[PDB]
Design a protein around this motif. Structure first.
Motif, PDB file in Angstrom:
ATOM      1  N   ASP A   1      25.868 -16.169  -4.595  1.00  0.00           N
ATOM      2  CA  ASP A   1      26.469 -15.078  -5.354  1.00  0.00           C
ATOM      3  C   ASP A   1      25.950 -13.743  -4.852  1.00  0.00           C
ATOM      4  OD1 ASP A   1      27.472 -17.220  -6.704  1.00  0.00           O
ATOM      5  OD2 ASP A   1      26.924 -16.500  -8.718  1.00  0.00           O
TER       6      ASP A   1
ATOM      7  N   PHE B   1      25.004 -13.045  -1.874  1.00  0.00           N
ATOM      8  CA  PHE B   1      25.587 -12.704  -0.600  1.00  0.00           C
ATOM      9  C   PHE B   1      27.048 -12.307  -0.725  1.00  0.00           C
ATOM     10  CE2 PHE B   1      27.759 -14.022   3.386  1.00  0.00           C
ATOM     11  CZ  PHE B   1      27.381 -12.888   4.086  1.00  0.00           C
ATOM     12  N   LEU B   2      27.830 -13.144  -1.397  1.00  0.00           N
ATOM     13  CA  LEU B   2      29.232 -12.840  -1.618  1.00  0.00           C
ATOM     14  C   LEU B   2      29.353 -11.463  -2.208  1.00  0.00           C
ATOM     15  CD1 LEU B   2      30.770 -16.168  -2.557  1.00  0.00           C
ATOM     16  CD2 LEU B   2      30.171 -15.073  -0.433  1.00  0.00           C
TER      17      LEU B   2
ATOM     18  N   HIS C   1      27.248  -8.986  -1.776  1.00  0.00           N
ATOM     19  CA  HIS C   1      27.078  -8.029  -0.685  1.00  0.00           C
ATOM     20  C   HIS C   1      28.400  -7.826   0.073  1.00  0.00           C
ATOM     21  CE1 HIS C   1      26.086  -7.246   3.691  1.00  0.00           C
ATOM     22  NE2 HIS C   1      25.658  -6.136   3.116  1.00  0.00           N
ATOM     23  N   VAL C   2      29.114  -8.915   0.334  1.00  0.00           N
ATOM     24  CA  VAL C   2      30.394  -8.845   1.042  1.00  0.00           C
ATOM     25  C   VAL C   2      31.383  -7.959   0.289  1.00  0.00           C
ATOM     26  CG1 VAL C   2      32.151 -10.238   2.154  1.00  0.00           C
ATOM     27  CG2 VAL C   2      29.979 -11.221   1.597  1.00  0.00           C
TER      28      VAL C   2
ATOM     29  N   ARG D   1      30.823  -4.569   0.668  1.00  0.00           N
ATOM     30  CA  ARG D   1      31.276  -4.052   1.906  1.00  0.00           C
ATOM     31  C   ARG D   1      32.721  -3.689   1.759  1.00  0.00           C
ATOM     32  NH1 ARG D   1      29.128  -4.783   5.772  1.00  0.00           N
ATOM     33  NH2 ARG D   1      27.318  -3.531   6.301  1.00  0.00           N
ATOM     34  N   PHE D   2      33.462  -4.545   1.097  1.00  0.00           N
ATOM     35  CA  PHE D   2      34.881  -4.302   0.811  1.00  0.00           C
ATOM     36  C   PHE D   2      35.073  -2.933   0.207  1.00  0.00           C
ATOM     37  CE2 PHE D   2      38.877  -5.844  -1.553  1.00  0.00           C
ATOM     38  CZ  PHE D   2      39.635  -5.679  -0.416  1.00  0.00           C
TER      39      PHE D   2
ATOM     40  N   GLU E   1      36.614   0.946   0.386  1.00  0.00           N
ATOM     41  CA  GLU E   1      37.343   1.552  -0.718  1.00  0.00           C
ATOM     42  C   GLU E   1      38.651   0.807  -0.919  1.00  0.00           C
ATOM     43  OE1 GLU E   1      37.044   5.544   0.538  1.00  0.00           O
ATOM     44  OE2 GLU E   1      38.248   5.288   2.355  1.00  0.00           O
ATOM     45  N   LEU E   2      38.718  -0.396  -0.364  1.00  0.00           N
ATOM     46  CA  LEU E   2      39.893  -1.237  -0.500  1.00  0.00           C
ATOM     47  C   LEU E   2      40.065  -1.590  -1.962  1.00  0.00           C
ATOM     48  CD1 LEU E   2      40.400  -1.208   2.382  1.00  0.00           C
ATOM     49  CD2 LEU E   2      40.024  -3.679   2.540  1.00  0.00           C
ATOM     50  N   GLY E   3      38.937  -1.831  -2.620  1.00  0.00           N
ATOM     51  CA  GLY E   3      38.932  -2.359  -3.964  1.00  0.00           C
ATOM     52  C   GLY E   3      39.754  -1.487  -4.892  1.00  0.00           C
ATOM     53  N   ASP E   4      40.503  -2.131  -5.780  1.00  0.00           N
ATOM     54  CA  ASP E   4      41.091  -1.450  -6.921  1.00  0.00           C
ATOM     55  C   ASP E   4      40.024  -1.354  -8.023  1.00  0.00           C
ATOM     56  OD1 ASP E   4      41.005  -3.778  -8.580  1.00  0.00           O
ATOM     57  OD2 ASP E   4      42.873  -4.509  -7.686  1.00  0.00           O
TER      58      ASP E   4
ATOM     59  N   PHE F   1      38.383  -4.669  -9.970  1.00  0.00           N
ATOM     60  CA  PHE F   1      37.464  -5.163  -8.960  1.00  0.00           C
ATOM     61  C   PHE F   1      36.152  -4.412  -9.116  1.00  0.00           C
ATOM     62  CE2 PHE F   1      35.759  -5.273  -4.563  1.00  0.00           C
ATOM     63  CZ  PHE F   1      35.846  -6.629  -4.304  1.00  0.00           C
TER      64      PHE F   1
ATOM     65  N   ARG G   1      34.079  -5.470 -11.720  1.00  0.00           N
ATOM     66  CA  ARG G   1      33.454  -6.758 -11.419  1.00  0.00           C
ATOM     67  C   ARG G   1      32.219  -6.532 -10.543  1.00  0.00           C
ATOM     68  NH1 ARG G   1      38.392  -8.956  -9.188  1.00  0.00           N
ATOM     69  NH2 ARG G   1      39.262  -7.308 -10.527  1.00  0.00           N
TER      70      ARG G   1
ATOM     71  N   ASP H   1      49.293  -1.293  -6.342  1.00  0.00           N
ATOM     72  CA  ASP H   1      48.722  -0.644  -5.160  1.00  0.00           C
ATOM     73  C   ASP H   1      48.441  -1.672  -4.056  1.00  0.00           C
ATOM     74  OD1 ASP H   1      47.808   1.592  -3.663  1.00  0.00           O
ATOM     75  OD2 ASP H   1      45.739   1.274  -4.303  1.00  0.00           O
TER      76      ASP H   1
ATOM     77  N   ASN I   1      45.601  -1.700  -2.361  1.00  0.00           N
ATOM     78  CA  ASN I   1      44.224  -2.078  -2.606  1.00  0.00           C
ATOM     79  C   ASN I   1      44.198  -3.217  -3.632  1.00  0.00           C
ATOM     80  OD1 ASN I   1      43.660  -0.033  -0.759  1.00  0.00           O
ATOM     81  ND2 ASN I   1      43.249   1.503  -2.348  1.00  0.00           N
ATOM     82  N   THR I   2      45.205  -3.265  -4.492  1.00  0.00           N
ATOM     83  CA  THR I   2      45.343  -4.401  -5.395  1.00  0.00           C
ATOM     84  C   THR I   2      45.649  -5.705  -4.651  1.00  0.00           C
ATOM     85  OG1 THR I   2      46.092  -2.944  -7.185  1.00  0.00           O
ATOM     86  CG2 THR I   2      46.440  -5.333  -7.445  1.00  0.00           C
TER      87      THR I   2
ATOM     88  N   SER J   1      45.093  -6.406  -1.331  1.00  0.00           N
ATOM     89  CA  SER J   1      43.874  -6.719  -0.601  1.00  0.00           C
ATOM     90  C   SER J   1      42.830  -7.359  -1.504  1.00  0.00           C
ATOM     91  CB  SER J   1      43.292  -5.467   0.011  1.00  0.00           C
ATOM     92  OG  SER J   1      44.317  -4.612   0.411  1.00  0.00           O
ATOM     93  N   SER J   2      42.433  -6.640  -2.550  1.00  0.00           N
ATOM     94  CA  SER J   2      41.448  -7.142  -3.505  1.00  0.00           C
ATOM     95  C   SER J   2      41.769  -8.551  -3.962  1.00  0.00           C
ATOM     96  CB  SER J   2      41.377  -6.225  -4.726  1.00  0.00           C
ATOM     97  OG  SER J   2      40.773  -4.995  -4.404  1.00  0.00           O
TER      98      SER J   2
ATOM     99  N   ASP K   1      39.321 -11.822  -3.206  1.00  0.00           N
ATOM    100  CA  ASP K   1      38.829 -12.663  -4.292  1.00  0.00           C
ATOM    101  C   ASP K   1      39.307 -14.091  -4.106  1.00  0.00           C
ATOM    102  OD1 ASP K   1      37.957 -10.224  -5.132  1.00  0.00           O
ATOM    103  OD2 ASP K   1      38.747 -10.392  -7.187  1.00  0.00           O
TER     104      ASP K   1
ATOM    105  N   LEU L   1      37.048 -15.556  -1.177  1.00  0.00           N
ATOM    106  CA  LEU L   1      35.686 -15.769  -1.633  1.00  0.00           C
ATOM    107  C   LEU L   1      35.656 -16.937  -2.577  1.00  0.00           C
ATOM    108  CD1 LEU L   1      34.216 -12.287  -1.827  1.00  0.00           C
ATOM    109  CD2 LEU L   1      34.580 -13.916  -0.015  1.00  0.00           C
TER     110      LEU L   1
ATOM    111  N   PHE M   1      27.700 -21.284 -12.861  1.00  0.00           N
ATOM    112  CA  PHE M   1      28.487 -21.090 -11.656  1.00  0.00           C
ATOM    113  C   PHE M   1      29.820 -21.793 -11.852  1.00  0.00           C
ATOM    114  CE2 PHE M   1      29.667 -22.178  -7.220  1.00  0.00           C
ATOM    115  CZ  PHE M   1      29.530 -20.938  -6.623  1.00  0.00           C
TER     116      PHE M   1
ATOM    117  N   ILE N   1      34.981  -8.063   7.706  1.00  0.00           N
ATOM    118  CA  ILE N   1      33.739  -7.555   7.114  1.00  0.00           C
ATOM    119  C   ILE N   1      32.473  -8.155   7.726  1.00  0.00           C
ATOM    120  CG2 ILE N   1      32.405  -7.322   5.059  1.00  0.00           C
ATOM    121  CD1 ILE N   1      34.658  -6.753   3.514  1.00  0.00           C
TER     122      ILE N   1
END
Lengths: 202, 202
Positions: A11, A13-14, A16-17, A20-21, A25-28, A31, A34, B1, B3-4, B6-7, B11, B14, B31, B67
């Motif tokens: 968790d 590491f993921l 961290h990934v 990076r995403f 700034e890809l993230g909405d 996200f 989260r 969007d 970015n939505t 992609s996000s 997810d 992962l 988990f 990434i």
């Protein structure tokens, strides 16, 4: 449980990934929520079972790298070499690398996924650490075998790497040397380290 | 969007990784609860923006692979080749691969990250698809360029790959051929496909 440790390092590491995403700034937004909330849950989690994150995350990186290694699923298979594939340094004839030895007063420590071994009764000698290892740039990635040698060539000490999680880093090896030396010097002895090492090590 | 999207694909990927984890049963319980609950949240999510998961997950696999490609962070850098590094097949002299052409009645479709191009007025000819591509095993990974050639060697059609997400798969290429052919045949024409392709394609 050990599955608890593993799960945590994953968790970590993921996560961290994902940062990076969201670094791209890809993230909405949801996200990125989260991301924050899982970062807090993570600090709490690692506080409690008492592992710091940095290393938990390298561990996770190794576990996951292993997963991404095994599929097959056609292509979900990835190919990654970011690698400035690396140059190898050998201070040790294999004649030396393989040579009998033992400790009269054995001292064994483990740190950063390396075993440090030392003979406690070795006094007023002059020893040189020789190390076969690997270099990227001028900074070490990895160690293959370190051994400590007297005037008359003899093994009074060893630093060998271990198959644990995470693996060992240039750092782990630098402190490792520090510990081997410093303990050698404590019962009087003088430790010169090979040029290669000097040139690379620290 | 965007970015939505992609996000979501991230997810999704992962998550696939985590399942792999819990496949090794490494996961502890909470988990595995994150796994189930996130699988439901995912089905809902992908239902609503109306992307199926399988491909969302390959996309995510490509984003993430990107990434993990860029760090540096010392080693968080991974090295992965699960690769049975691959053999290349060329039906096309470069003289052909680079040759002028156009469409009188141009028809352009995009499917599975491939552009299919076809001349609508080409009738009662005999054409052969030639394709330069790549093979792992007997099953194709990837296509470099497909072109359709008449009796007198001439381009009436093309299937070229696209830099989109996800990339294209042997499948995407198989249906792609199907579409190029089937449309060629619709205004009367006979499409033989090269042996290589026959031997590989489908």
């Amino acid at each position: 449980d050990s599955n608890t440790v593993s799960s945590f390092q994953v968790d970590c590491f993921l996560w961290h990934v994902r940062k990076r995403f969201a670094d791209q700034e890809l993230g909405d937004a949801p996200f990125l929520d989260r991301l924050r909330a899982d970062q807090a849950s993570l600090r709490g989690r690692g506080s409690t079972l008492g592992l710091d994150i940095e290393t938990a995350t390298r561990a996770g990186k190794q576990i996951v790298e292993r997963i991404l290694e095994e599929e097959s699923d056609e292509a979900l298979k990835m190919t990654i070499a970011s690698v400035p594939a690396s140059r190898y340094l050998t201070d040790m004839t294999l004649e030396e690398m393989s040579r009998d030895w033992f400790m009269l007063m054995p001292k064994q420590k483990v740190a950063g996924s390396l075993c440090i071994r030392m003979d406690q009764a070795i006094m007023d000698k002059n020893i040189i650490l020789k190390a076969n290892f690997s270099v990227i740039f001028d900074r070490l990635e990895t160690l293959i075998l370190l051994r400590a040698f007297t005037e008359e060539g003899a093994i009074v000490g060893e630093i060998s790497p271990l198959p644990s999680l995470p693996g060992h880093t240039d750092e782990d090896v630098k402190n490792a040397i520090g510990v081997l030396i410093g303990g050698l010097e404590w019962n009087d002895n003088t430790v010169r380290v090979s040029e290669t090492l000097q040139r690379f090590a620290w």
